[PDB]
Write a protein that holds these residues in place. Structure first.
Motif, mmCIF file in Angstrom:
data_model
loop_
_atom_site.group_PDB
_atom_site.id
_atom_site.type_symbol
_atom_site.label_atom_id
_atom_site.label_comp_id
_atom_site.label_asym_id
_atom_site.label_seq_id
_atom_site.Cartn_x
_atom_site.Cartn_y
_atom_site.Cartn_z
ATOM 1 N N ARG A 283 0.431 -1.658 0.516
ATOM 2 C CA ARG A 283 -0.058 0.259 0.202
ATOM 3 C C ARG A 283 1.124 1.668 -0.493
ATOM 4 O O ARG A 283 0.554 2.205 -0.416
ATOM 5 C CB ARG A 283 -0.521 -0.060 0.764
ATOM 6 C CG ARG A 283 -1.432 0.994 1.276
ATOM 7 C CD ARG A 283 -3.065 1.030 0.446
ATOM 8 N NE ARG A 283 -3.202 2.925 0.941
ATOM 9 C CZ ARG A 283 -3.936 3.100 0.010
ATOM 10 N NH1 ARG A 283 -4.462 2.249 -1.614
ATOM 11 N NH2 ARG A 283 -4.778 4.639 0.469
ATOM 12 N N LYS A 284 2.141 1.317 0.734
ATOM 13 C CA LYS A 284 3.057 2.342 1.470
ATOM 14 C C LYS A 284 3.563 2.562 -0.741
ATOM 15 O O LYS A 284 3.695 3.783 -0.828
ATOM 16 C CB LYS A 284 4.409 2.577 1.904
ATOM 17 C CG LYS A 284 2.944 2.630 2.844
ATOM 18 N N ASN A 285 3.678 1.550 -1.042
ATOM 19 C CA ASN A 285 4.417 1.612 -2.796
ATOM 20 C C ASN A 285 3.647 2.254 -3.393
ATOM 21 O O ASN A 285 4.043 2.943 -3.858
ATOM 22 C CB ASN A 285 5.133 0.580 -3.221
ATOM 23 C CG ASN A 285 6.307 -0.206 -2.094
ATOM 24 O OD1 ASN A 285 6.900 0.526 -1.415
ATOM 25 N ND2 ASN A 285 6.037 -1.832 -1.846
ATOM 26 N N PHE A 286 1.866 1.460 -3.222
ATOM 27 C CA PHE A 286 1.066 2.102 -4.286
ATOM 28 C C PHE A 286 0.700 3.813 -4.072
ATOM 29 O O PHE A 286 0.941 4.295 -5.130
ATOM 30 C CB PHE A 286 -0.092 1.580 -4.195
ATOM 31 C CG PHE A 286 -1.403 2.006 -4.325
ATOM 32 C CD1 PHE A 286 -1.428 1.857 -6.050
ATOM 33 C CD2 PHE A 286 -2.959 2.438 -3.606
ATOM 34 C CE1 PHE A 286 -2.941 2.904 -5.840
ATOM 35 C CE2 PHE A 286 -3.230 2.892 -4.184
ATOM 36 C CZ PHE A 286 -3.801 3.039 -5.920
ATOM 37 N N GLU A 287 0.854 3.893 -2.974
ATOM 38 C CA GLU A 287 0.627 5.554 -2.265
ATOM 39 C C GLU A 287 2.058 6.078 -3.128
ATOM 40 O O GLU A 287 1.012 8.069 -3.384
ATOM 41 C CB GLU A 287 0.074 5.758 -1.253
ATOM 42 C CG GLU A 287 -1.280 5.531 -0.540
ATOM 43 C CD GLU A 287 -1.222 4.811 1.188
ATOM 44 O OE1 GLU A 287 0.144 4.967 2.025
ATOM 45 O OE2 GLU A 287 -2.078 5.586 1.091
ATOM 46 N N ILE A 288 3.368 5.792 -3.155
ATOM 47 C CA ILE A 288 4.009 6.901 -3.149
ATOM 48 C C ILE A 288 4.179 7.206 -5.536
ATOM 49 O O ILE A 288 4.106 8.207 -5.939
ATOM 50 C CB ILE A 288 5.607 5.788 -3.234
ATOM 51 C CG1 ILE A 288 6.280 6.309 -1.664
ATOM 52 C CG2 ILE A 288 6.704 6.742 -3.610
ATOM 53 C CD1 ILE A 288 7.142 5.212 -1.438
ATOM 54 N N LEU A 289 3.961 6.208 -5.637
ATOM 55 C CA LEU A 289 3.621 5.361 -7.360
ATOM 56 C C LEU A 289 2.486 6.637 -7.727
ATOM 57 O O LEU A 289 2.645 6.743 -8.298
ATOM 58 C CB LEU A 289 3.338 4.547 -7.677
ATOM 59 C CG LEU A 289 4.385 3.001 -7.834
ATOM 60 C CD1 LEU A 289 4.415 1.972 -8.258
ATOM 61 C CD2 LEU A 289 6.798 3.899 -8.140
#
Lengths: 45, 45, 43, 46
Positions: free
Chosen positions: B10-16
């Protein structure tokens, strides 16, 4: 967090950048822990 | 010209997603302001 | 405020510089066009 | 020689770039067969 999420992006160049970042963010957990620790040390010092 | 990707975390998704937004909005910045930005960045070196 | 970062690798630098620009310029999109963009994304 | 300096405005922007700096730098330390394995796994997702 192991859940997967989807996005779309307009523009091939933008896609290619995001794919590089996706790769780096996903590959990071495959680094052996001793090498991560050595990296963290270098970065603060 | 729309491209689809998925990412784990989820944190990777939010950065992207933050970067997807900034990269897509770049197309809508008036060109002289892009030129102005490049000039301003010459004062930061 | 402004902050500094060092990065190893020329390609890595190119990537971060492209992202930096997009992040630093997105505030200059005229608001009516931002509003139009966000409507399209909701779809 | 191979290290490059960047400056960025805004705390949140800085934090985003720092997280990506770290991931991009660390990816050079992934053993190559695990990179290959990752690319194979990715074929099951798209």
């Amino acid at each position: 967090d192991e859940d997967t999420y989807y996005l779309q992006v307009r523009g091939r160049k933008n896609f290619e950048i995001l794919m590089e970042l996706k790769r780096s963010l996903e590959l990071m957990e495959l680094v052996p822990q001793p090498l991560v620790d050595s990296y963290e040390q270098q970065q603060q010092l």
